[PDB]
Write a protein that binds this ligand. Structure first.
Ligand SMILES: Nc1ncnc2c1ncn2[C@@H]1O[C@H](COP(=O)(O)OP(=O)(O)O)[C@@H](O)[C@H]1O
Ligand SMILES: [Ca+2]
Ligand SMILES: [Mg+2]
Lengths: 26, 160, 57, 371, 57
């Protein structure tokens, strides 16, 4: 039985969400 | 896996220095000099993404073979690019299965390494006998002297 | 009028300074306990992982 | 496209796209109208707060669950809950996504037919399929046999399965579940002085039950110990202060599961309805069911239940058989994980109830071949 | 003279009160984080002890 993951959302979006306002270049 | 190793080998010092600066900016104040499994998971939860701690353990086992839970530069970039899993579905299954079945030109149910040798001669990529030997070891799990069809699925599993 | 205003200003400054020092102490102790708890959590997670692997074996 | 694996449940609605590990949005299923008058003008006061929003304004609301025991008693509120789930917690219009609801065994037909009629007329989904809540929990464990005890919050049901062939004559559905345990805990707390009456304070009692209660390995010894020492009294801080101390109410609340005579129910506990469900099966598959007993559902998360149940069944069962109780750490979302796995299968892709089929046979299509 | 003194005292009082209120809010956030850390620590401890007992058996 294979497993599918949608938890791994786009990594650029993850970087943006973490850096918050300071997410300007990354 | 080594897929991300190939992806970062495709990448250059631009990505290296970009992620180095990202470390300097966000991991600033951390006493680690790397990124830990727990630190990465907690930071992800802080931003909103909530992967499982079992995924943290899996990723740390993958990139950090020593089990330290940290990320050496190469394995650090591998772990960082592991988050964005754009390429999935591993190419095609049945058509590639037919290609591998016809690869057994002798049609004995056995894939000789010399057929692989001829096909690689066609490819001509920079490879020595030890390199193809190591690749077959990665493929010939049961060490039956051939490329097993189930092992053909295994080594091409997820491979685009 | 000025006398009354000065008295009220002095009292307000006193109470605000007291509350500010209380807040600084609370922030310091909160940070200390927070860091200690996070380290304990890391230790517990590591122990859990190790014992789980041994249990599977 | 991707399928929507919704799971109505009773107490927590769990939803998310098919193929993931955990539900995307989990929130209580309560709809609470305000009850006081309201004097501020222009505050933007709505007429009904649903989902997790009504667990923050619960001080001035009258929360009321739209699902009593598996069955749905208030269809307008359930429609409101579904609308919220689709549009605000997932933000995907249902016009472009198949749905996979879940339903308890032995439920009234009209409930299921109304559910499919709503999904096809109001939300206008492309295709929906209804599955029994226990088969999914068996999917998630990666087994293919075993007898699964899915003690949810509404209803506890016990479906035995062998080699993929369900045994319809051995399903034992019992209506004791987490909600009755909450009510019984709220009723025995009054023996110390703490009175919770309002429908909002039921949530506080539920939190007490989740955080403090545990299942005793042996009931009489614990009752004797808690009556002599004071090593059990754990305290808890209400939402306003005034900490409370729970004594032997800790293991008396979840003990109701194994002795339903506490809340006046006649039937036998969850330790004996499993053995009865096994004994109704054929004589040759009892060993496999003994060895693959599966736990699921929220209420089976009490600390120390996987040992009490094993001790009880070992007492009942013959001495030679091995009794093993599968209690995965991801118990709460086991049904939804199984639902995701089932919706992600290629073999299952032609079992959906397509809309044209519903247009030709009406809502009674669900009882037909497309189960 | 008294008017000038009163106005200066007023401005100082307002700015110090604002800073105290902001630091108090951040202290409350820190306390919330500490509570979450406490819960995580307790849960992990229970995990570890349960797994160890099962391994022994
Ligand atoms: N950690 C826990 N410990 C004890 N009881 C719990 C815990 N989590 C949930 N519960 C109980 O289980 C119920 C949730 O059950 P759930 O599986 O969500 O029901 P459903 O099958 O309707 O989804 C809650 O009402 C609560 O009483
Ligand atoms: Ca060959
Ligand atoms: Mg359920």
């Amino acid at each position: 039985r294979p497993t599918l993951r949608r938890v791994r959302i786009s990594a650029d979006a993850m970087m943006q969400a973490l850096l918050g306002t300071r997410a300007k270049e990354s | 896996d080594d897929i991300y190793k190939a992806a970062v080998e495709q990448l250059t010092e631009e990505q290296k220095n970009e992620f180095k600066a990202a470390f300097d900016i966000f991991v600033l104040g951390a006493e680690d000099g790397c990124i830990s499994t727990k630190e990465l998971g907690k930071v992800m939860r802080m931003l909103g993404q909530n992967p499982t701690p079992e995924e943290l353990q899996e990723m740390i086992d993958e990139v950090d073979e020593d089990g330290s839970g940290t990320v050496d530069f190469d394995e650090f970039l591998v772990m960082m690019v592991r988050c964005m899993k754009d390429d999935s579905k591993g190419k095609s299954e049945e058509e590639l299965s037919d290609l591998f079945r016809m690869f057994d030109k002798n049609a004995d149910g056995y894939i000789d390494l010399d057929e692989l040798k001829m096909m690689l001669q066609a490819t001509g990529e920079t490879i020595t006998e030890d390199d193809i030997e190591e690749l077959m070891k990665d493929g010939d799990k049961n060490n039956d002297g051939r490329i097993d069809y189930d092992e053909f699925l295994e080594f091409m599993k997820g491979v685009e | 009028e000025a006398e009354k205003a000065a008295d009220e200003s002095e009292r307000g400054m006193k109470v605000i300074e007291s509350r500010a020092q209380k807040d600084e102490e609370k922030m310091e102790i909160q940070e200390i306990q927070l860091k200690e708890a996070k380290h304990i959590a890391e230790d517990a997670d590591r122990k859990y992982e190790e014992v789980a692997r041994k249990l599977v074996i | 496209t991707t399928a929507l694996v919704c799971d109505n449940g009773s107490g927590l609605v769990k939803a998310g796209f098919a193929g993931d590990d955990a539900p995307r949005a989990v929130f209580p299923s309560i709809v609470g109208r305000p009850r006081h008058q309201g004097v501020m003008v222009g505050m933007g006061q709505k007429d009904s707060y649903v989902g997790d929003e009504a667990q923050s304004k619960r001080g001035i609301l009258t929360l009321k669950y739209p699902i009593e025991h598996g069955i749905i008693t208030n269809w307008d509120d359930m429609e409101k809950i579904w609308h919220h789930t689709f549009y605000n917690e997932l933000r995907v219009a249902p016009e472009e996504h198949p749905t996979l609801l879940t339903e308890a065994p032995l439920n009234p037909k009209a409930n299921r037919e109304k559910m499919t009629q709503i999904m096809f007329e109001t939300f206008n989904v492309p295709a929906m399929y209804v599955a029994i809540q226990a088969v999914l929990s068996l999917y998630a464990s990666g087994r293919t046999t075993g007898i699964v005890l899915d003690s949810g919050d509404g209803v506890t049901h016990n479906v035995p399965i062998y080699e993929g062939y369900a045994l319809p004559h051995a399903i034992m559905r019992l209506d004791l579940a987490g909600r009755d345990l909450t009510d019984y805990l709220m009723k025995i707390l009054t023996e110390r002085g703490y009175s919770f009456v309002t429908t909002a304070e039921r949530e506080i009692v539920r939190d007490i039950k989740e955080k403090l209660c545990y299942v005793a390995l042996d009931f009489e010894n614990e009752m004797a110990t808690a009556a002599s020492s004071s090593s059990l009294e754990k305290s808890y801080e209400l939402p306003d202060g005034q900490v409370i101390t729970i004594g032997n109410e800790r293991f008396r609340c979840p003990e109701t599961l194994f002795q339903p005579s506490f809340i006046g129910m006649e039937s036998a506990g969850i330790h004996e309805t499993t053995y009865n469900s096994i004994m109704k099966c054929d004589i040759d598959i009892r060993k496999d069911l003994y060895a693959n007993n599966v736990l699921s559902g929220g209420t089976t998360m009490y600390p120390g239940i996987a040992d009490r149940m094993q001790k009880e069944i070992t007492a009942l069962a013959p001495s030679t058989m091995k009794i093993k109780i599968i209690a995965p750490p991801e118990r709460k979302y086991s049904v939804w994980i199984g639902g995701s796995i089932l919706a992600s299968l290629s073999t299952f892709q032609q079992m959906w109830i397509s809309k044209q089929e519903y247009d030709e046979a009406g809502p009674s299509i669900v009882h037909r071949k497309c189960f």
